[PDB]
Each structure stands twice: as C-alpha cells, then as structure tokens.
Amino acid sequence: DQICIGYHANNSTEKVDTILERNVTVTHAKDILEKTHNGKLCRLSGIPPLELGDCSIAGWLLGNPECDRLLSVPEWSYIVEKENPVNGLCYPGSFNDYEELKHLITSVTHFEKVKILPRDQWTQHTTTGGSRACAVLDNPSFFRNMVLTKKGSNYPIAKRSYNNTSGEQMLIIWGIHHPNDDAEQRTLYQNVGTYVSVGTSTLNKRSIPEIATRPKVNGQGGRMEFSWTLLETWDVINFESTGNLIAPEYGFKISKRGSSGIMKTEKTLENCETKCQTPLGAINTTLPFHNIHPLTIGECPKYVKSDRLVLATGLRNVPQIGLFGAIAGFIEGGWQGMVDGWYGYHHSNDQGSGYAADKESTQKAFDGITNKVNSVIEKMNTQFEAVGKEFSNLERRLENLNKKMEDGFLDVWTYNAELLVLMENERTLDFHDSNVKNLYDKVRMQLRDNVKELGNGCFEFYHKCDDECMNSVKNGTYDYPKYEEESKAA
Amino acid sequence: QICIGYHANNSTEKVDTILERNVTVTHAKDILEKTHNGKLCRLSGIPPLELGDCSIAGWLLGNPECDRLLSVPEWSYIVEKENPVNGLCYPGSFNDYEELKHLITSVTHFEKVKILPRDQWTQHTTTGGSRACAVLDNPSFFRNMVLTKKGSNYPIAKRSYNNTSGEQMLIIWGIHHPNDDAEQRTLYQNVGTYVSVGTSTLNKRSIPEIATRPKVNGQGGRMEFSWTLLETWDVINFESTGNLIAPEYGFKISKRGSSGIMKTEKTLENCETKCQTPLGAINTTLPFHNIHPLTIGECPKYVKSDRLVLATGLRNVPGLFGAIAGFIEGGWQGMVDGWYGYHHSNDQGSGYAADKESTQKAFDGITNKVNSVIEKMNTQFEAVGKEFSNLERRLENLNKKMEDGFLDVWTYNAELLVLMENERTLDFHDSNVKNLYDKVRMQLRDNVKELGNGCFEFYHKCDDECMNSVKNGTYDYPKYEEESK
Amino acid sequence: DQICIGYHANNSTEKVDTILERNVTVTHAKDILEKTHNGKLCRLSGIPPLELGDCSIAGWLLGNPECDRLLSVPEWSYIVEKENPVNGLCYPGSFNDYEELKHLITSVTHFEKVKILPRDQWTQHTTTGGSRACAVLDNPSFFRNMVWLTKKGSNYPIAKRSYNNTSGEQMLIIWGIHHPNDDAEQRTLYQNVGTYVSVGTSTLNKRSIPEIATRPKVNGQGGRMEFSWTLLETWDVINFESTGNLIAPEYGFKISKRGSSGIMKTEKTLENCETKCQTPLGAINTTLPFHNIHPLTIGECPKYVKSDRLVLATGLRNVPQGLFGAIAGFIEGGWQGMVDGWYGYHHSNDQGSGYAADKESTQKAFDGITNKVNSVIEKMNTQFEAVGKEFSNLERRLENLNKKMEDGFLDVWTYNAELLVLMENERTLDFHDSNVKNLYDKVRMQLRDNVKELGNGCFEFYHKCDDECMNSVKNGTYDYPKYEEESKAA
C-alpha cells in the first residue's frame, strides 16, 4: 500500500520568463498587456466627437465656405481631425493665440451660435465684400461667420456693441485686414491711417493696418489677422473702426465640460462605445498596460514599449510519458491524470487506485494567485487624459518638453512592467514549488515511521491502509497510534 | 519533551500581502503620514509674507485698501486667500505678472525705497487720482505711483534713477489707456504719445491703446503695468511724451531661492515646520503622506492611498516554509521575551524560554527593511502650487499632467512595495521558526522522537542543564546515546 | 570515511547591501552603476558637434568680428559653448525668439551660408556704416553678415529688395532694426523721421517702428539693435522695405534638420573619439542601466541617479574559514579549497583527498545569476535626449517646470534602482542558500541510514566507501542495497 504526492501537468505550451530563467513552460498564464483594438472610431462615455475632417478649427469657426456641410454636434467629448487639414484660412493671414483657443473648445456641453452683430445692420457700409481665395461656384465669396468696405465713397466710423445676454460665456472672433498697397487701402476703406479697437471689461486692443508687399497666397497678397476673446455674461464688447475691420456676425456660447484634446486620424464615427480611444481604434480592457498607440484619449491603461507581458498563474508544466526542490526536482514530473486540482495524491491499496486533488492547498493556491493578479491590476490608477497636444512652430521648446515628459514616464512604466513580471513569475513558480513541498511534509510528519520514504514523492505503508485510512491522511487526521502493525518494519 | 514555538499577542492590526488580504500581525508600522498640526507655520525659522485679501500687485502698487498690511523684510513663502479682493483698484492689467510673482515668493533681503520723489516732476501735474481707488470717499490713487499736463502743456517726462542701493531693485511702471481721443487730449494734450523705459538690458515701449470699454470699478479707462529688475549700478531711463504712470518707490530685493504662493484662510500661529500645507504643517519621518497635494517645503511623496501598513511582527495566531500556522498550529501568548523560542517539560517543571539569538537577528533584519524603505527616499525643497494666466492653459495642463504622472507612479509603487515586502516579511518569520526547529532536530538525531507539532520527545531523561544545552546549541549526543527507545 | 557538502569561499573583500542586511561580503559582485567616462568631447554617432568656444550663436550668425572666422562644419549633431561666452551682440540689443532659434540649429544636416542680397546692389544707400562698439583694430566695424544701411549724402530713399529662395532648402534669414539713442543720431544716420521697417513672406508679416530714446550706454552705445529671424520656404519670397533703420541681411543660411539636440556647456574641445552618449565631463560607453556622472547629457544615455554605488551580488556570502539555513547556517563556513565551482563535496577516504565541485548545480546557478544580471540591464529602454535646455530671463516658471520634471525622474529612478538592488541581493543570497540545501538533501536521500547525519553538512558512512562509491554519491547513483549489508553493526 502507498500514497504519492504530486502536482498538475497538462498540454499547455505557454511560456513565460522569470528573473532566473527564460521560456519556462507553465500550465496556465495570463497576459496583462492589451494589444488589440476594435478598429473603430467611437463615442466616449456616450458623448460623440466633433468630426472636422478636412477643416481646421479656425476654418470651421470663421466659416470657411469649404466647411459648410460640417455636422456640428451640440455636445462633444473630443475633436477628430485629419493630419494636415487643408481647409483653414482661405483668405491668407494668421490667428493669434490659436492653440489656446483650440485647447479651450476641446470638450463642450452645450455649444450654440448667436447672431451678435447682424450683417444687415451695418447700414452705412458695404457688406458683400468677398475674395477669389474663398471662391464659391466659383465667384468671390468669404468667411460666412464674418463681415466692411466703403459704401459708395464713404466709410463712416463703424460703432457697434453687444451685451452678452445669452446666459453663457461667449467666444468672439474678429479680424483686421492688412492691404497690399495704399491705393488698395483707399479703394476699400476710403480713409487712410485707420485703426480697429475692441474693448470689454478685460480686453483692451487697438490694431493698426499694416500695408506691405508680400507674395501671393491663394492668389492674394493681402493678409487677415484674427484675434479672439471670451465675453463674460452681462458684459459688453465694443467695436470701433475707421477701416480694415473684419467683423464677426456670430459669437459662440461655450460651456466647458472638462478638458480633452484633438485626435488625428482618417477614421469616422461609428458607435460602438468606449472609455479609451486611439487613432487606430478603441480599446476595451481591464489590463494595466497596452502597446497600441501613445496618443490616446479617455481613461487608458499605461502605454508601454513592450510586445508581451505574460504572468504565470499555474506551475511549471512537466508532463511525463526551484528554491524548494520539489517540482521538477525530487518529485520528477507532473500528473496529467490529476485534473481537479493543482496538487494532490495518488494511492494504491486493496480497494484500488488512485487520484485525488488536495482541496486545501489547491484552494490556497487559487486564492493566492487570484490575489496577486488582482493586486497588479487593481492598484493601477486610471484618470482621464488627452495625450496629443498642440504647439505653434515657435513653441518647439515647449513641445520638446512635453515630449521629454511622455518619454520619461514611458521608460518608467516599461521597465517597471517588464521587471515586475519577471520578478512575480519567479515568486509564483516558487510558491507552487513550496506548496508541493509542504504537502509532502504534511504527509511525512503524520506517518512518521509508520511508513517508508520511497523517493519520487512516494510513501510505502508498513501497514494496511484502506480508503478510510487514506482519507485521514489526505485530510490531516491520520492516527499514528497504530505504530503496530508497523514493526513489520523489523 | 522540548517544543519549538513562536510569539502571539492580542494585536488586531491587519496588513495586506501580494497573496493575502486582512492578515493579523503581531506588530505593524504605518508608513503613510495622515496628520497635520492644523496650523500655518514658519518654514525653517523664516515666516511667510501674509497678504490677507490683497494681491501681490495690489500690495506693490500701493492699493489704498492695502495700507495696513504689515510686511516683513524677509519671508520663505507667500500666503494669499483663494481670491484676493484688493488688486488693481484702477482697472487694467499687469504684464508678466506671473513671472513677477514667482520672483518674490522667497526673499532676503526686501526693502521699499524712494527712487523718484514725486515733487521733482516740476513740469507736470502729479495729483491726479480716481474714484476707482476711492478713499473716504474721494478720488485717490495707487500710493507708490504717480502724470498729467500742467496748465495746457505736457512736456517730455524724462527722469532716471541709478541703483546705488547695493542690491537688485524691482521697479514697476504703467501706461494709461484713455476712453477716447478727447480724454487723451484733456489729460495729456498730445495724441500720438509713448512711454519708453530703458536700462542696459531692457528696452520697452508702450503706446496708448484707446477703445470703448465698459466701466470696471466705475471707470472705462485702463492702466497697463510692466516691471523690470534693475541691476546694481545700472540706470533706468523713463522717457514719455504722455500717459506714463510713474513709480516713486522701488524695491531692493535679495533672492536666495524660489518658493511659492499658498492659498489658505489661515494666519501665522507661531510654530516651526519643514513642510507646510494649506491645512497645516507636517512633522514626520515617513516617506509618504496623503494630506494635500499643494505643499511647500521638504515633504514626503504625496500618494492617493488611504493606508500603507508595513508588517513588522509575524502572523498573529493565538507561509512558504510551513511552520507558522503550518505544522506548528498556533502562537504562544505566554512567551514574552522574543519572537521565537522553546517550551520545555521536565521532572523539574515548565516551560517557556525565548531564543534571543534568532529573535535579535530577525529584529535587526526587519529594522533594516523598514529604514531601507523610509530612508532611501529623497526630500529636496519643493513648492507644488504654481501660477498661470488664463492664456497659459496648455502650460497649466502640462504641469498637471506631470504632477498626475508622478502621483500615479508613486501611488502604484508604494502600494505594491508594501504588498510585496509584507509577504516576504511573513515568510522571513516563517523561515526563522523552521530553521530553529531544524537546529534542534539536527542536534537530537536519534535521541528523540519528532512528533510533528513542533515537539520533541526525548528517549532519555533531559534535566534543566540538558535542556539549556539544547537551547544554546551544545547538546551532547554521544553522552545520551544509550537510547533504549 | 565521510562525505561533506560545502560551498566556495575566497579572498574577496567586496561588499553588498541587502534589504535585511548591511555590508555583507560576497565572493563575487557586479556594479550596474556606470561611474566612468573617457574624459573627452566626442563625435555623436559619427557626427561632430559645432564648436563655438567663447562665441554665442547670435554672435556667430550675425558675424561678430571676433566670431566670423569661426570655421564651422557643414553638419553637426550638437553645439558646444563655454559656460559664459564673451562674444555676442557687440552692438547692444536683443534677439526676438532667440531660444527657439538656438533650439532649431541645435542639430543639422545640411548647413550653408549663402550670399542672398549682395551688399553692392543697395545703390541708393550707404552701406559701409559701422560702430566703435564693434571696433576691429581699432577702426569702427560691424556684424560681418549684415548691412547697416544709412543715408547717401542727405537722402535715404525707400529701400526695397526681395529674394526668392531658389536654394533647394529652407533658409534661415535674420534682420534687425536700429533703435537710436536720440533724434540727432536718427537724423545723422537716416535723415528721415517717422521711419519704419517692413518684412513679408508667405507666412510672415511685420512692420516695426524705431524707438528713439535715451538709455544707459553699453559698449559705449545708447542705441540698440533688435534682431528677428524667419525660415523662408523653398520657392518663397521675402520682401524688405524701409524708410530707415533697417539692418539688412547680406547672407542667409540653407538648413536641413533631422531631429533636435541641444547645447552643451563645457571648456572641453573635440577629440578623436565616438560615442552614443556625451557628457560635459567626457563620453560614456556602457550598457549599464544607471549612471551618476553628470545630469546634462546628450545622446542615448543610462538613467541618471543620485547614488555612488549599485552593486549586485553574483556570488554567495563569503564565509572564509539565509532563508534556507545552510550557508553560514548549519554548514558554518565556506571552503577556500574548492576552486572549481560554487558548491560541492569534500570526502575523506582511505585513499586520501579531497575536493570536487558539483558541476550541474554550479552551472545552473551561473545560468540563473547571468539571466538575473542581463534582465536588469536589457529591460532598460534608452532614448535620444538632450537634457540641458535654454530659457530666457522671463521664462523662470517654465525653467522651474523643467527642473521639477528632471528632479521628479531623478527621485523615481534613484529610489527604485537602490531598492531593486537591495531586494535582488536578498533573493540572490537565498538562491545560493537554497542550491546548497538542495544538494545536501539530494545526498541525504541517497545515503539514507547507510550513514550518520552529523548536523554540520557531513555524512559518516556505516561502511567503507572507496573513490568509486564516493563518486556514485556525487553522481546520483549511490546504490544503497549494495552496502546495506554492513551498517551500524548490521
């Protein structure tokens, strides 16, 4: 009669690395690295992205004729654009503090156009001024959200105002025209030596037109320079100009949800839903890390420069035909026949044989490994982030500093993730090793000299041991007083 | 007989390990600090500048509402209310205001001095003021600042100052932006005017920007202030054809390092600290804290955690090696002098005796673990809160992203350090018990039965002297080898 | 006749720290902190740095007389300056967006000065003007790459010239405006009052008016020159127009970029060596993960930490004469006499002797430790970075943000490198202890009761055991039943 201590083996060819060993085959393993995306551009927490396609934010807000059929949701979580949007300032020029503007309208509630300065009420000015650079049909056209040239032969001082009674912060854009030459100034605005002034309770600005010689861009040597401000509720904005004013017709009511970013991609909305979007597609995961794309938006796993992070959950797989020396050691191989536990017994007596999982050590192992995997996964913080940022080409240093920070964390997470995995795997294999070793000793210390140690994790009894006796061994209530029979040993 | 055993007590302290939750241990050490003293304190002997509900601009310009301030000549940080009420009484703006605020967060020395006495502007009217700065309640004006046409003429306003004071000097000046050309003529006579300021490093010019504007503090006009740091022995030249708001004073300033502004309602209560937060100060040696992110001083790492409890004692049982809660089922309330030890049973009596050797070794070990964790942590001076204008949102976001990045790294790594090391500490105790058990077993060999519960049953009479040789590892096997099992 | 289990000891004096223990002597050790450098300034990935010495980038590009013959390379990978360069704006002034300019030319391929606006084609203006502030020896001179346009006789007619970039590459172009000390100087130089300077390209549009005002003399001058720059695209035109106060370029700079680098501040000069990582003290050439040489590096560098020592144990605890209780435990000391392995056997016989190492155990241990060491090294991700940055006097907050980030990483890497070392040294010592305990048990299970277990690592045989039998024990094929007849007495 005999009982033998042993451990589970199977047909897994799954491999993991440890600190001490490479490519160890384990019975089971879990990948903590998310590599797959659904390939879709989705909504984020129910709220869709604003889809700009070929238009830039400036193009959209000024109303570049080529952005007319923009869908323009009432509410958005992020903004989707193509890499180098072709439709922006159709009439050539610049846009002050453009990047701050973008960052501001990145996530909105609540977004409503308002006709703050009706085209029709500039009664003493011509209002149909257009350009072939903004051509439609084609005829000379212009930014649709914007409007002034002399009426006949007179450019009276233009004085209009607007009180923000919309019940919300209003974004307002305006421009100044920089003519090509003096004759052009006088033919457009009659007056020379002009200005454009804009005032609110916090904004103070007066611009003078700059008449100079420049190359043609979209066929035009002239330039238009735009600025913007946030008009507070119940506050007034006053425009005054003797010429060169590019007036807005509309302002924009803004309620900031939070702060998001702009995603560059050629994909379009679908729904689908996600908590984490990438330019490649969305990510749905529990895992602490991913390697899909650095530029994400939402609550995402830590991005790492890794192609594989696999945790061992089972033990070393040793099918047959360690710090503790049990597994692949003094018990030379695992049992494929023992399918209902991690560690257990094989027995032979008169009544037969012989596999039985040990429920106690098995359940300790299940509870332990589950805890370990859960620790590694659950302790990871996950706050909302919009990685990609916008910088002008005179902000290269600021851009480089942002890049240096993202690279820094990447290096920290990657190295930390890789080593954590190598170190825990080593521990996990030793944990199994030790459980086996302790099971063997549990049996050895019960039986004492009522049995012989045969090697290979086996015990031969110096007495008959029936199924009831075997149970007592397996559940730790073996009765040693019975040391006779046993002198059968001598 | 002689038995091997380990310590137990009435502790109910819980720790988590990588493999286990809520494990009761005999002793634990919390390494997360979560108490402050509730007070606003001095930082390394040097007090903060308390501005109450005045802003830094309001204080330096001399907003009348800031007269009874009480500044010190030296401070290690600045305390402000979340939203100061007293800044620019006369509406306007302050160029590079944030750069200025950053410069004076921490000073030594700091002294206001008169550099351009106002009575020496003999060709200009200097008494001008505003109901925006109303006192009592007549027109008044920023008390450190001063120019309007005299009769009907505004001659060039040209004066200079040489910084012979011995320290770098802060000097602030402004330009006034009137309501319309008519008011410009009324105040300054001329229309196309300018304000030029020059030192040997700074060249700045401002022109009036007239626009129609809503009344703020009753006024449509605005003032735009600028500033420079005048080096020792350098000159500053003011030259203006109109619109200059001139300084009468300057500020001598010696800077040691940089600090920050703290937003709080509290007032200095007279205590010392090395680490201040808006809720109170922190006096601690622990490597982590969760009191508040915006600290000033030499502070523990701020983590998102509620609890970081390191196990020091062993599992409390009133492991990898199979002894604790293993073949030795439980602890011994009775053994008080050590973690590990023996219970003996003789004709002479019983029974407890601590093993001071393996206990001391263990204690030294755990002592090294604790202060390896605690002492490897760096703690250089830092001021977390920073200032950004509302056109630096991207920059402010970059800063938050950075603080959030380190918060995440530290929080994760601290939680995981505690779990990992707690499992090793419990295993370390387990190993010490096992090793002690084996020391005895390998000493007794044949002369004793291994019972399997921690106990050894002698095949001979072992009196007290003999027991002592077992404990001190000199048991004489050959002497008692008479066996007769 | 006896056989003993033991471990290697030597003359090593090397010390390591572990999480539980300070100053433990080990037989072998390996430092993973790079502390040495070659003490030279080197080519970075084949490409030399630009050496400016005591000249500033501005001094060099404008052609300050003390800077002009600088003798540059056509391609560079970084820039080297003295801490505080003596030569810059000899005529006092300022440079707009200077830090961004310096960041732009930090790393190039290709670079080439070209004469874009021949000094002599300014026919209607005087062109030879200079300053005592730029005195050569000791005649008034001027920035050699620029042209100080002044009146011809009593006339300054409108100055107008343009240049089309047909060079093949983007072109850096610089210009300036003179802000005189007083009206008399304005009239002497330019005749006209109320002048302006105008410059325009496809994207750039600027008009500046001179600022006449009294200022402290610097290098004898009260006036100032404010310089600006732009990048002119291929096939674009730049237009200059001035009625006075223009400081025109004569030259432009063809520039191609292939990434960004940095400026390095050192007294050192270029030697003939190659590196992937440069320091102001010398070049680093290591695979190690950490270094403590200097914070301001350029290249693909190890992570900088505050420590002076990171020593990993590789050999075992040196006990000249643990979790597992053998090393410095029940086997009290090591053997200076076992030189052919980490663990092994002694054996005392009728035939004498002796020592012999267990090759298999030793070999498995060497493999483990090697993987360990390589894991810590190989998992570290390295990226190209230039640590030192340029910020102006009004960018203190930005500078402080950069410092806070570097300090943040420094604390993270230093704390984790040191804790890693301590943790792994604990596990390494215990690894060895375990290998020893496992070897001893392997012997114990073969010999069984044919021998006495002393308790100090030795086994006393109950039977004569010659060299062949001593080998079977070492071998794992002892044959217990062969000597079973003959033990104790029977």
Ligand SMILES: CC(=O)N[C@@H]1[C@@H](O[C@@H]2O[C@H](CO)[C@H](O)[C@H](O[C@]3(C(=O)O)C[C@H](O)[C@@H](NC(C)=O)[C@H]([C@H](O)[C@H](O)CO)O3)[C@H]2O)[C@H](O)[C@@H](CO)O[C@H]1O
């Ligand atoms: C007036 C005319 O017919 N001029 C002929 C030249 O063409 C004109 O050249 C000017 C440059 O001085 C402009 O480019 C003109 O283009 C427009 C445009 O933008 O399309 C014409 C628009 O109608 C006009 N819109 C408004 C509101 O004024 C616009 C603006 O004036 C400018 O943008 C102001 O900066 O200009 C263009 O038609 C022609 O090249 C030349 C060849 O022989 O003959 C000229 O008679």
Ligand SMILES: CC(=O)N[C@@H]1[C@@H](O[C@@H]2O[C@H](CO)[C@H](O)[C@H](O[C@]3(C(=O)O)C[C@H](O)[C@@H](NC(C)=O)[C@H]([C@H](O)[C@H](O)CO)O3)[C@H]2O)[C@H](O)[C@@H](CO)O[C@H]1O
């Ligand atoms: C006292 C009062 O309320 N008077 C009423 C007139 O108000 C005047 O309106 C002008 C604008 O047209 C200014 O706001 C005047 O305010 C002051 C101020 O700031 O307090 C008066 C100061 O004395 C003056 N200081 C100087 C040096 O000139 C200051 C400056 O002019 C401006 O700040 C420049 O921007 O203005 C205010 O008294 C009002 O015009 C009339 C009804 O319209 O009723 C009067 O009772």
